[PDB]
């Protein structure tokens, strides 16, 4: 019998993520009851709930249930460190058959807010077999891993360290990085930030994870596995995702009033007009079909603040990113209509160049220094160093979830390598 696994909420803060663990229930399976059929997938969650929210699933082929979630629930009573109080460990086993009635309830998890006792709700009215070792907050995760549509997806090969080093500082060639993104860019991508120097696929936790990276492909993913030097490689696999794929985003039209938990794409027109602020950070508003919204462009989106501290007041925008504090954290952005701006000046000497200053009410201007004159005010559109088109963050502060210029259909994108 195909049955679908879905795992959350097995992350320490030391030592164990979510994954990791995916990985060894995947080969206990596979030595005791069966094959596990395709690739797990990687289902990254509301970002917005109080780095990295993401569930896991994969499917199987056994004789009998009852067997797998016992293999399931002894490698989370073995692995999974249960004394950590941030650490509720879920588990479901759901027939191919019904994964498919879980859609909406994938979608929820991605996009809003869902509640314990609706994921409770969910398993009573199916009778789906599960394991909640403590809280049964991961069993939110766990059916949304198994619920997910995707329609479009992404790959990661995640690579997992050897337990001896884990909590260890990482050994790896950088440059090994840098050159494997130059040769299989775009096929993988948002592992390196050029303008930054940082390799992003590389985290800074004390985690199992080594290195994982982004991809199109199978094949650019292991010719990225081979190219790369690292501290040896002990496990690895390979995930369908939903990174990269902007699954979290709602966009207006589908909605009365905005909320904070909660990711958009809104169109507006700048009101209030771009401020730096006490930290590094550059905010805005904009005038919407809800009324007056913030944008805000933090500081660690370094070189991408630059655009946003030009556009001006009526220019037509359109911005993504999660509401928190009731302030939008751009992830991204489209200049759509530039504002035209109009303006009355004095006019400009033909001989030496300078500024005519006046020469009285209604005197005209004059330029002294010449013996030259002129009656009427110059008067030019405004010509900014803006171009329209669309415009992101920097791979170093792409989030999970944020679709990348590059992988979008579009034209007028600005991308800086
Ligand atoms: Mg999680
Ligand atoms: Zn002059």
Request: aromatic fraction near 8%.
């Amino acid at each position: 019998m195909r049955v679908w696994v879905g795992i959350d909420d097995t992350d320490s803060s030391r030592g164990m993520c979510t994954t990791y663990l995916a990985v060894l229930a995947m080969e206990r399976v596979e030595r005791e009851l069966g094959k596990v059929i395709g690739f797990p997938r990687l289902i990254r969650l509301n970002p917005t709930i109080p780095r990295g929210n993401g569930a896991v699933s994969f499917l199987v082929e056994v004789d009998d249930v009852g067997e797998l979630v016992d293999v399931v629930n002894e490698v989370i009573i073995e692995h999974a460190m249960l004394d950590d109080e941030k650490t509720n460990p879920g588990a479901v086993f759901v027939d191919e058959e019904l994964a498919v009635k879980l859609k909406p309830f994938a979608d929820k998890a991605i996009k809003d807010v869902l509640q314990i006792d609706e994921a409770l709700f969910v398993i009573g009215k199916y009778f789906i077999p599960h394991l909640r070792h403590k809280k049964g907050r991961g069993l939110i995760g766990a059916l949304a891993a198994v619920g997910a549509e995707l329609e479009d997806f992404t790959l990661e090969l995640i690579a997992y360290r050897y337990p001896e080093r884990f909590g260890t500082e990482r050994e790896y060639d950088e440059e090994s990085f840098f050159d494997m993104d130059y040769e299989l860019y775009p096929q993988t991508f948002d592992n390196v930030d050029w303008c930054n120097d940082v390799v992003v696929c590389i985290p800074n936790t004390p985690c199992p994870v080594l290195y994982g990276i982004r991809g199109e492909s199978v094949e650019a993913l292991y010719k990225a596995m081979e190219s790369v030097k690292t501290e040896p490689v002990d496990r690895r696999m390979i995930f369908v995702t939903n990174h990269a794929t902007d699954m979290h985003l709602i966009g207006e039209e589908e909605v009365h009033r905005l909320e904070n938990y909660r990711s958009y794409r809104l169109r507006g027109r700048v009101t209030l007009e771009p401020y730096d602020i006490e930290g590094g950070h550059v905010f805005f508003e904009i005038d919407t079909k809800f009324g007056s919204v913030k944008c805000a462009a933090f500081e660690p989106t370094k070189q991408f603040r630059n655009v946003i501290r030009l556009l001006r007041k009526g220019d037509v925008v359109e911005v993504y990113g999660s509401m928190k504090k009731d302030t939008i954290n751009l992830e991204k952005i489209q200049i759509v209509e530039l504002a035209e701006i109009w303006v009355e000046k004095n006019p400009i000497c033909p001989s030496c160049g300078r500024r005519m200053e006046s020469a009285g009410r209604g005197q005209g201007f004059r330029c002294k220094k010449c013996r030259t004159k002129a009656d009427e005010k110059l008067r030019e559109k405004v010509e900014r160093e803006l171009q329209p088109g669309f415009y992101e963050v920097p791979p170093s502060a792409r989030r999970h979830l944020s679709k990348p210029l590059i992988r979008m259909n579009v034209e007028g994108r600005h991308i800086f390598r």
